[PDB]
Amino acid sequence: PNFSGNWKIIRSENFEELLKVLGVNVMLRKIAVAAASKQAVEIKQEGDTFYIKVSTTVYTTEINFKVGEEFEEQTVDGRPCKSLVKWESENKMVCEQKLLKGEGPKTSWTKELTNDGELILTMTADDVVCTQVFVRE
Ligand SMILES: *C/C=C(C)/C=C/C=C(C)/C=C/C1=C(C)CCCC1(C)C
Structure with missing residues (x-):
């Protein structure tokens, strides 16, 4: 969708x-x-092809994937990983990640478009979930 x-x-x-x-x-x-x-x-x-650019004041990163197809990115703390996105409903996707090297907490993220028009991103490490809420510019 949108x-x-x-x-x-x-x-x-x-x-x-x-x-x-x-x-x-x-x-x-x-x-x-x-x-x-x-x-x-x-x-x-x-369709189910996404291009995503996440930026802050001094850094920018681009993410390209197709739902159901493995791709490589990095974890929140910067470690390279293999990722796979699946739909959980019409407007929510969930990504599971696996470290390319070594071991660490189990990480993942979700993105959801709410009916209120918000974009909700969650990022998880084991027991701990970070939630970030966005609105359209
Ligand atoms: C689908 C949306 C994704 C994968 C968003 C990923 C965002 C990050 C990995 C953000 C990382 C950040 C840091 C590692 C410190 C600086 C602040 C953030 C939130 C930009």
């Missing part, structure tokens, strides 16, 4: 706790939390 658009963040909850699980030290966590409040997301959706 994930396509330019999204700007309005809320970010439990991000510090997520980074803590992933081993990030406290000063860097606080700085990452501040960076997260400037997060912008650009999405182009065509």
Whole structure:
């Protein structure tokens, strides 16, 4: 459907706790939390092909995938991973990730388009879930 658009963040909850699980030290966590409040997301959706660009003040990353097809990206803490996105309903997808090297917490993310017009992103490390809410620019 209509994930396509330019999204700007309005809320970010439990991000510090997520980074803590992933081993990030406290000063860097606080700085990452501040960076997260400037997060912008650009999405182009065509059928089940997605192009996603996530940026902050000094960094930008692009994600390209097709639902049901494995691709490579990086975890929240920056480790390379194999990813696979599946639909959970009309406007929610869930991505499971697997580390390319070594071991770590089990990570994943979801994106959901609500009926209120919000884009909800969740990111998970084991027990800890970060939720971020976006609205259209
Ligand atoms: C589908 C949406 C995805 C995969 C969004 C991914 C977003 C990130 C991996 C964001 C990472 C950030 C940091 C690692 C610190 C700076 C703040 C963020 C939230 C941009």
